[PDB]
């Protein structure tokens, strides 16, 4: 939606390496604000965004309590799945779960999320109606029964529709100037000769937020999609993203190529070219 909050849980059974580990990270759109790792020296909830640090000690103790309990709950979960699939205590296994809520224009819940995966594959997931589940296989059916009896769906619906949206709004308010302001990318084209007949024109987009962006190379107007080498959007390390698009073109003719950049932080799409200097 307009904004979203997500929690990514990773619980891992590591035979020999140690007791079941549990990691949890919190995100508001493309910004991480919290982190918990039941393996660090002091297992506690730590801040990862400046704006979240304004929350008092009560908030932290609250998150830490939940996460510590989650650590134990997930250990059971891992064992249960092990049995479900008739697995041994010899192999490593990982459970992943994503919780989240999308804020609509009206400030209310637009869409809720809750999906789990065992060893990289879908296991169980809450449906769009926030009242029914979808088991991937018969083993997941067991979990579904437990969860239906325990009324987990209703519990989650309450959270997604209420608590999630409520706190998402608080977070958005606290970090207004960073979370609600879209940063446009700094663009520039570079020329890299590969041979006396061809050269690579690389169009850069750095320091933009959020990650969503579209880079395109055009020759006299026609989109050179079929020949554009595009890298996956990558984090700059300072809460911003960077990405580039390159195209191999013949010497001289390069003056016929233009880069088209699209990002929400721009009033209209940019169109730049390589300026020989």
């Amino acid at each position: 939606g307009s904004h979203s909050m997500r929690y990514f849980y990773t619980a891992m059974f590591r035979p020999g390496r140690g007791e079941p580990r549990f990691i949890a990270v919190g995100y508001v759109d493309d910004t991480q604000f919290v982190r918990f790792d039941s393996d660090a020296a002091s297992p506690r909830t730590e801040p990862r965004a400046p704006w979240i640090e304004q929350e008092g000690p009560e908030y932290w103790d609250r998150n830490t309590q939940i996460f510590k309990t989650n650590t134990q709950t997930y250990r059971e979960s891992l064992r249960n799945l092990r049995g479900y699939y008739n697995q041994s205590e010899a192999g490593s296994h990982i459970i992943q779960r994503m919780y989240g809520c999308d804020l609509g224009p009206d400030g209310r819940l637009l869409r809720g999320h809750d999906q789990s995966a065992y060893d990289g594959k879908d296991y169980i997931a809450l449906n769009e109606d926030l009242s029914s589940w979808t088991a991937a296989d018969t083993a997941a059916q067991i979990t579904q029964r437990k969860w239906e009896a325990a009324r987990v769906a209703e519990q989650l619906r309450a959270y997604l529709e209420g608590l999630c949206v409520e706190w998402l709004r608080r977070y958005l308010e606290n970090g207004k100037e960073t979370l609600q302001r879209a940063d446009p990318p700094k663009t520039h084209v570079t020329h890299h000769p590969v041979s006396d007949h061809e050269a690579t024109l690389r169009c850069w987009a750095l320091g933009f937020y959020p990650a969503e962006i579209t880079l395109t190379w055009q020759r006299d107007g026609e989109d050179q999609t079929q020949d554009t080498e595009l890298v996956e959007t990558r984090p700059a390390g300072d809460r911003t993203f960077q990405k580039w698009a390159a195209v191999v073109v013949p010497s001289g003719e390069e003056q016929r190529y233009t880069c088209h950049v699209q990002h929400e932080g721009l009033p209209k799409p940019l169109t730049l070219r390589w300026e020989p200097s």
Partner: peptide
């Protein structure tokens, strides 16, 4: 703020 995983898998 996260929910509470009361019920295991």
């Amino acid at each position: 703020l996260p929910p509470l995983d009361i019920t295991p898998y």
